[PDB]
Amino acid sequence: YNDGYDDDNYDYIVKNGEKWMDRYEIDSLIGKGSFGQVVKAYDRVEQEWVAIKIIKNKKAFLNQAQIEVRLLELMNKHDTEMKYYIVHLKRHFMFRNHLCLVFEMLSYNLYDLLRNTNFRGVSLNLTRKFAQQMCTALLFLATPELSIIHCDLKPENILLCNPKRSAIKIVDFGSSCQLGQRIYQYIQSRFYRSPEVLLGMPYDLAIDMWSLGCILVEMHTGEPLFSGANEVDQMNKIVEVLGIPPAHILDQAPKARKFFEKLPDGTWNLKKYKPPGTRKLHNILGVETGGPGGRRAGESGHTVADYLKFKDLILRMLDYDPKTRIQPYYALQHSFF
C-alpha cells in the first residue's frame, strides 16, 4: 500500500525516529482515530515539540481535513494571541500522500480525564473552569466573520493543554460548518445531539450550546446525561429529564412523528421510560443530597447555592427552543461564573 508506506487501513505506518522533510523527527504515536493518527514529533527548525495529525490516504478523509485546515486558518487568523481556547494549527503539508496538520502539542482529552476520576466526575470548581473556557470559545466561534458551528462537541474533542492544569483547547473541526454554508442534515454525536437535529429542523450555532450543557453535566457526574442507543432512545432519554418539547416546535418538525404523536386536543405525547420530565436534573446533580452519588457531601466547593446556580445555567443550555437557549455572551455573565 502506497509503495510500502501505508497499512491496509489507509494509515501511514509510523516509524520511530524517522526524519521528514529535513525538519521533523517523528518520536511516537500519541493518538489515533477515524481520521488517521497523531504523532509527537520534534520540529528541528522551530526547536519545539509538535503534534502532527497524519490524515489517512483516502479521499474522503483528505477532504474532511481540508475543511478542517480552512476553518483553523480562518480562526487562528482572528486569535493570534491564542486566547479563545481553539487549538492552534501551525502549518500543514502533504507528505507521502498524507495530508499532515502540525499543531501545538496537547495532553489528555476530557474523556480520558473522566476515566482518570474512575467515572465519578471532576469537582464543581473544575467543571466551572471548563465551562468558562468553553463558553468563551463559543463566543469566538459566533463572531460574524467566523460563524462556525463545531458540530461534534463531546469530551473526547476537548483536550487539556497540560495534565496538571485546567486550561483546554477544542479540537476537530473536520465536521464543522459555517452558518452561511450549512450543508449537513445528519450531525453531532448521538449523546450530544440537539433536539432540532433529532427533529430534522433548521439549526444554527445553538446546537453547540446544547452539546456543552450535556458535556458539563457529564464532567461532574462522570456519566453521559442522555446515553441513547439510537435516535428514538436518545429522544426518550431527553424527554425523561426535560418533558415533551413545546407544541410550537413539534408542529414544525419534519421528524416529529418518529418520536411523538399528536392528540385530538392538539397536544403531543410520546409514541408507545420514566414519565416525561420526572427524571429531574435537580436529582441527577444531587443539588440537595450531596452531589452526584452523594459523594460531595462534606466537601467544600459544593454548596446547595452553588449547585442551584449550575442547575440554572445547564437548564438554559438545554432549552428545547434554539431561539431562547442561552447564548455565549449571556452564559459568561451568568452567576455560576
Residue set of the binding site:
30-38, 53, 103-106
User: Which residue number, 184 or 273, has a Cβ lying nearer to ligand KQZ?
Assistant: 184
Q: Which of 26, 41, 75, 106 is the binder for ligand KQZ (CB under 6 A)?
A: 106
Using rule CB under 6 A, residue 38 touches ligand KQZ: yes
Q: Which of 11, 37, 53, 206 is the binder for ligand KQZ (CB under 6 A)?
A: 53
Q: Which of 26, 39, 51, 170 is the binder for ligand KQZ (CB under 6 A)?
A: 51
User: Which residue number, 93 or 295, has a Cβ lying nearer to ligand KQZ?
Assistant: 93
Residue pair 43/26 in contact by the 8 Å Cβ criterion = no
Using rule CB under 6 A, residue 65 touches ligand KQZ: no
Query: Would you tell me how many other CB atoms lie within 10 Å of the CB of residue 59?
Result: 9
Residue 31 C-beta: closest distance to ligand KQZ, Å: 4
Stretch that binds ligand KQZ, among 15-23, 27-35, 128-136, 191-199 (CB under 6 A): 27-35
User: Which residue number, 40 or 280, has a Cβ lying nearer to ligand KQZ?
Assistant: 40
- Give Rg (Cα) of the chain: 21
- Is 321 in the active site? no
User: Which residue number, 91 or 257, has a Cβ lying nearer to ligand KQZ?
Assistant: 91
The three cell numbers locating residue 254: 419534519
Using rule CB under 6 A, residue 103 touches ligand KQZ: yes
Catalytic choice (6, 11, 152, 208): 152
User: Which residue number, 146 or 168, has a Cβ lying nearer to ligand KQZ?
Assistant: 168
Size of the site for ligand KQZ (CB under 6 A): 14
Residue pair 104/87 in contact by the 8 Å Cβ criterion = yes
User: Which residue number, 104 or 306, has a Cβ lying nearer to ligand KQZ?
Assistant: 104
- Cα–Cα distance measured from residue 84 to residue 293, given in angstroms and rounded to the nearest whole number: 34
Among 172, 161, 187, 149, smallest CA distance to 36 is for 172
Query: Would you tell me how many other CB atoms lie within 10 Å of the CB of residue 141?
Result: 25
Q: Which of 171, 209, 214, 215 is the binder for ligand KQZ (CB under 6 A)?
A: 171
- Cα–Cα distance measured from residue 218 to residue 174, given in angstroms and rounded to the nearest whole number: 24
Stretch that binds ligand KQZ, among 1-9, 21-29, 41-49, 99-107 (CB under 6 A): 99-107
> What own/partner pairs with CB < 8 Å and gap ≥ 24 does 162-168 have?
162/107, 163/107, 163/108, 166/126, 166/129, 166/130, 166/133, 167/133, 168/85, 168/110, 168/130, 168/133, 168/134
Using rule CB under 6 A, residue 31 touches ligand KQZ: yes
Q: Which of 65, 75, 86, 87 is the binder for ligand KQZ (CB under 6 A)?
A: 87
Task: For Cα atoms 300, 307, 225, give the angle at the middle one, nearest 5 degrees.
Answer: 115
Stretch that binds ligand KQZ, among 57-65, 100-108, 136-144, 227-235 (CB under 6 A): 100-108
Which conformational region is residue 224 in: left (phi greater than 0), alpha (psi within -120 to 50 degrees), or beta? beta
Using rule CB under 6 A, residue 150 touches ligand KQZ: no
Stretch that binds ligand KQZ, among 58-66, 74-82, 98-106, 143-151 (CB under 6 A): 98-106
Using rule CB under 6 A, residue 92 touches ligand KQZ: no
Residues catalogued as catalytic: 152
Binding positions for ligand KQZ, rule: CB under 6 A: 30-31, 33, 35, 38, 51, 53, 87, 103-106, 171-172
